[PDB]
Write a structure and sequence with these properties.
part of a larger assembly; 2 chains; A: 81 residues; alpha+beta; two-stranded antiparallel ribbon; B: 151 residues; mainly beta; 4-stranded antiparallel beta sheet; globular; Gp32-like (chain B)
Chain lengths: 81, 151
């Protein structure tokens, strides 16, 4: 979330705590004490790209390719269709 | 008509040790209130979080205060009562010098039987006012038994 209190904008704000209070002093509404903490990021100003071609490459490391039983005939028939 | 006069009121103060037979107060002060009692508060109320009300019992002492003319025999006896430390007497499951005041409030026979109490405060020496007349002396007692009224 982004909290704009009074000319003071805080981005990357996440709720950490909240306390609701129900008292005889206020029977209609409920006082509450929200508490947010900021999420620290390495680069507060990231660099993006407009068009879909030009991303930097993302590595996934080792995969351990999992298994199916479909045989080459099914793959062929799928490619035919 | 209702007669709410105070003339003829007598007090009999009997203490466990200082005055086992007791003494009598009849010479009350002319300027201060002869008998003055704070309002007893034997109940209390609390508010629930839904706006409701709860009523409970609370401890309530009876704070009485009697005013007597400076220099009188009643004043001397009350000073004797005041200048008697609780540590100089023996001890019982009851209170240290249990002193009770029988109040005959009128010829009606009110017969207030305030008991289970002790003296708390009072004047040690007589104060001389601006006018030159010694101020009436007011002695305060506290009590825990406040029942026995008749008529």
């Amino acid at each position: 979330y982004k909290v704009i209190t009074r000319g003071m904008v805080f981005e990357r704000m996440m709720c950490t705590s909240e306390a609701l209070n129900q008292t005889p002093d206020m029977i209609s509404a409920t006082p509450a004490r929200l508490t947010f903490s900021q999420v620290l990021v390495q680069n507060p100003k990231p660099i993006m790209f407009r068009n879909a071609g030009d991303s930097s490459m993302i590595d996934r490391g080792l995969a351990l390719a999992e298994d199916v039983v479909g045989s080459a005939g099914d793959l062929f028939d799928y490619a035919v269709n | 008509m209702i007669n709410v006069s105070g003339f003829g009121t007598g007090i009999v103060i009997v203490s466990a040790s200082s005055f086992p037979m007791g003494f009598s107060l009849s010479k009350f002060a002319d300027d201060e209130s002869p008998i003055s009692s704070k309002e007893l508060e034997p109940f209390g109320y609390e508010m629930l979080y839904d706006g409701g009300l709860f009523a409970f019992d609370k401890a309530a002492p009876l704070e009485v205060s009697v005013s007597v003319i400076a220099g009188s025999e009643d004043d001397i006896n009350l000073r004797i009562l005041l200048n008697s430390k609780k540590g100089s007497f023996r001890f019982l499951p009851g209170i240290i010098p249990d002193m009770t005041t029988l109040v005959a409030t009128l010829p009606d026979g009110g017969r207030t039987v305030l008991s289970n109490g002790t003296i708390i405060k009072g004047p040690a020496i007589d104060t001389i006012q601006n006018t030159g007349r010694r101020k009436g002396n007011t002695y305060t007692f506290v009590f825990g038994s406040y029942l026995g009224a008749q008529t």
